[PDB]
Structure formats: structure tokens, C-alpha cells
Write a protein that binds this ligand. Structure first.
Ligand SMILES: [Ca+2]
Ligand SMILES: [Ca+2]
Length: 162
């Protein structure tokens, strides 16, 4: 992926109204109307738009985009950086939520989901699940054949591909 390839993929990931919303905030720091902002303002615009880069991440980005020393980042490069951050933050949110889901499923807090806990959570959804359906999910998710689902197997069960 060239930079332009990365920029075309960044644009394809976002709806056009979202792109124009991001440009409306970006434009408030341009002033000069040139299609770019100081790299000193990148963190501010990113956080205004709901992203949370660390300082180390921002330094890494600035160094990626400011090799000519102009001290600016353009809008197309800004979109590439926003999509990278959106993907990273969403990944972190999903892992955090899966760890909370496991702590709820594991009613007895022993570090495993057993067939009784699994049957009880699935029946409470209201779905017409049978004991055979519950046993089939258990057997398919239980990689090491100990009769239970630990957090590593839970992550694989839920994420599915993984
Ligand atoms: Ca348990
Ligand atoms: Ca197991």
C-alpha cells in the first residue's frame, strides 16, 4: 500500500458525511486555507474527534508525516491516521468488553465457564436452545477437552475466526 493507497482505503472506510465532519474540525486549525495544519495541533484535533492517541503514538505519527520538515500534516494523511487510531481503539474496546462478559458468565469466579454456567446464560437469553445445542457449543469450544471453557477458549469462541 503506497500512501495514496492508504489514503484511498482511509476514505473508503468512512462515510462521506463523517469525512466532511472531520474536515470541518480540521479546517478550524488551518486558517491559511492550505489543506493542512501544524503537527502541534494534531493531538487536539484527534481528541476533539473522539480518538485517544498516546503521546508516543503522536510522536510516531508526526515523524511519519513530517519528513520534509514543513511542520504540517495534510487532510488526506490526517484521515489515514484517524482510521489507524479508530481501528486500534475499537480493538481495545472489544477486548475489554469480552473480559467483562467472561467475568459475568463465570458465576462462581473460578476462571472457567462450565456446562452449567453456559446452559444457564444461554437459556436466559430466551432463545429456544436445547441441552444438545448447549453441549454442542461446549464441545466445539473446549479445545483441551477438560469439559470447560477458560478465557483463552472464550475469546476464540466469541471471535470465531480466532
Ligand atoms: Ca465457573
Ligand atoms: Ca477447556
Amino acid at each position: 500500500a503506497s500512501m495514496t493507497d492508504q489514503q484511498a482505503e482511509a476514505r473508503a472506510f468512512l462515510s462521506e458525511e463523517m469525512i466532511a465532519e472531520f474536515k470541518a474540525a480540521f479546517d478550524m486549525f488551518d486558517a491559511d486555507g492550505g489543506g493542512d495544519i501544524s503537527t502541534k495541533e494534531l493531538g487536539t484535533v484527534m481528541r476533539m474527534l473522539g480518538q485517544n492517541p498516546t503521546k508516543e503514538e503522536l510522536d510516531a505519527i508526526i515523524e511519519e508525516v513530517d519528513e520534509d520538515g514543513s511542520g504540517t500534516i495534510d487532510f488526506e494523511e490526517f484521515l489515514v491516521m484517524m482510521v489507524r487510531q479508530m481501528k486500534e481503539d475499537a480493538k481495545g474496546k472489544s477486548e475489554e468488553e469480552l473480559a467483562n462478559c467472561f467475568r459475568i458468565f463465570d458465576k462462581n469466579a473460578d476462571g472457567f465457564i462450565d456446562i452449567e454456567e453456559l446452559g444457564e446464560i444461554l437459556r436466559a437469553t430466551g432463545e429456544h436452545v436445547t441441552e444438545e445445542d448447549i453441549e454442542d457449543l461446549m464441545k466445539d469450544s473446549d479445545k483441551n477437552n477438560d469439559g470447560r471453557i477458560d478465557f483463552d477458549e472464550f475469546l476464540k469462541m466469541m471471535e470465531g475466526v480466532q
